[PDB]
């Protein structure tokens, strides 16, 4: 029962982390879905647990194209995001705002979303 708490405690930590990412995803969805399609911010997109508090801007797997079309997931009621226009079919479900164009990017633009409006 010694190393059982290794996987149980890591399961609880990853559960609180993925619930933080779900809460930030829900609040960020509401703030972005308030914006009128030209004040939207450049967005790092992913389909995996993205952490806005522990994001490492060193992997070469990150872009910075401008988000649009905030809508719902019908059967699971999750939030989905389109990273280009609608007619590119790049629907993603874990986004985070970042100040800047592609590659060479700045920060993450925290609590500066409501100021865009």
């Amino acid at each position: 029962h010694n190393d059982e708490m290794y996987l149980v405690v890591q399961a609880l930590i990853r559960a609180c982390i993925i619930k933080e990412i779900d809460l930030y995803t829900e609040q960020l969805y509401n703030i972005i879905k308030s914006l009128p399609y030209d004040k939207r911010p450049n967005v790092v997109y992913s389909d995996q647990p993205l952490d806005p508090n522990n994001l490492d801007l060193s992997e070469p797997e990150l872009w910075a194209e401008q988000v649009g079309e905030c809508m719902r997931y019908a059967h699971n009621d999750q939030p989905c995001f389109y990273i280009g226009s609608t007619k590119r079919e790049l629907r993603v479900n874990y986004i985070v705002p970042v100040i800047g164009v592609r590659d060479e990017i700045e920060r993450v633009m925290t609590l500066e979303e409501v100021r865009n409006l």
Binding site: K33, S34, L35, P36, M71, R72, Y73, A74, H75
Partner: peptide, 24 residues
Amino acid sequence: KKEELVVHPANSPIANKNPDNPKK
């Protein structure tokens, strides 16, 4: 499939795309 349906929900505001439209 029904697994990949996406839909603007009912009774909530959604923004318009034409910037020459007086509604927003």
